[PDB]
Design a protein around this ligand. Structure first.
Ligand SMILES: Nc1nc2c(ncn2[C@@H]2O[C@H](COP(=O)(O)OP(=O)(O)NP(=O)(O)O)[C@@H](O)[C@H]2O)c(=O)[nH]1
Ligand SMILES: [Mg+2]
Length: 316
């Protein structure tokens, strides 16, 4: 009645977000006290996001739409220290709001594939009035949107369908992959996460490596590892929401030069799925269970995980 699930995938693929969803779906969510613990994370993520955009403006040579923002940028650094401690004054919120609304800042934001920017930047910056409110308490979605790369191994437990799940989460950044092997024993199923929207991005560890290519190499290694022959391989093609928006404006040929389909979700998503599934060297004896997901969407993850659990029960 015990099931061990191991989450694998490159950095930023959404592994830890899936972990959070298990608590929300099967453990009644994050309590008020638990949500408050994420307040400083939300504020830090928010401040780091606007700062990253401002830093990129210097690198890409983008001016502020309105010269008055120069002073707001100065004040941002003077007041930024508070956010990290869990405090968001009306003054700091005002500074961030004006910067976020600037046309130059927006021009830079829309060129984020050229630098490293948290996926939840817009989510938080567009909700400044709410998160800056007095006595602000992060919502479940706010918690799901937080970003903190995983170092070490995280173990979570929950019950579902009369089964006791033991979920293991590890970091996917290059420096953390050496630790994956510590979790290789007795795995019932591997949930390998892939950020669909990574197709036109490069690794933060190396700007010369395409993120999706890196993910493919990792999947090739895991899926074909003889050690996992009897371990169910679940493939989560994640960030489908970001992918749907991006495929409309950024050519998939950046990642796959041979792609001949249109700049639409269905054709492009199916193509990527085929690229990953084709890495399977034993197609007749090893099955991959693929699901398209939006890890921050609780309803999507609930239905997908329900489907995944059924396969695990029937196969293992
Ligand atoms: N829009 C969107 N954001 C997502 C999705 N999945 C994850 N994110 C966001 O992407 C960021 C990174 O997610 P996270 O789960 O930390 O990634 P990870 O694979 O655990 N990273 P690491 O390997 O470094 O530990 C978070 O801010 C999270 O909220 C998705 O499907 N859509
Ligand atoms: Mg993580």
């Amino acid at each position: 009645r015990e099931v061990k699930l191991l989450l694998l995938g490159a950095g930023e693929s959404g592994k830890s977000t899936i972990v959070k969803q298990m608590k929300i779906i099967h453990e009644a969510g994050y309590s008020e006290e638990e949500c408050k613990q994420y307040k400083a994370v939300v504020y830090s993520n928010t401040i780091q996001s606007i700062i990253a955009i401002i830093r990129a403006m210097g690198r890409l040579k983008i001016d502020f739409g309105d010269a008055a923002r120069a002073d707001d940028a100065r004040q941002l650094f003077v007041l930024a220290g508070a956010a990290e401690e869990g405090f968001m004054t009306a003054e700091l919120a005002g500074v961030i709001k004006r910067l976020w609304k600037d046309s130059g800042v927006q021009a830079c934001f829309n060129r984020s594939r050229e630098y490293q920017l948290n996926d939840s930047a817009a989510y938080y910056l567009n909700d400044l009035d709410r998160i800056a409110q007095p006595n602000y308490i992060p919502t479940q979605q706010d918690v799901l949107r937080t970003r903190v790369p995983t170092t070490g191994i995280v173990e979570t437990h929950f019950t579902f369908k009369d089964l006791h799940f033991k979920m293991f989460d590890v970091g996917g950044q290059r420096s953390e992959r050496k630790k994956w092997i510590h979790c290789f024993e007795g795995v019932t199923a591997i949930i390998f996460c892939v950020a669909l929207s990574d197709y036109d991005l490069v690794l933060a560890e190396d700007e010369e490596m395409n993120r999706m290519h890196e993910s493919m190499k990792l999947f090739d290694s895991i899926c074909n590892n003889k050690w996992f022959t009897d371990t169910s391989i679940i493939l989560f093609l994640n960030k489908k929401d970001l992918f749907e928006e991006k495929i409309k404006k950024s050519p998939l040929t950046i990642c796959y030069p041979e792609y001949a389909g249109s700049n639409t979700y269905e054709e492009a998503a199916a193509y990527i799925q085929c690229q990953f599934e084709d890495l399977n060297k034993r197609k007749d004896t090893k099955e991959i269970y693929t699901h398209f997901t939006c890890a921050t969407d609780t309803k999507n993850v609930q239905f997908v995980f329900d489907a995944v659990t059924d396969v695990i029960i029937k196969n293992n």
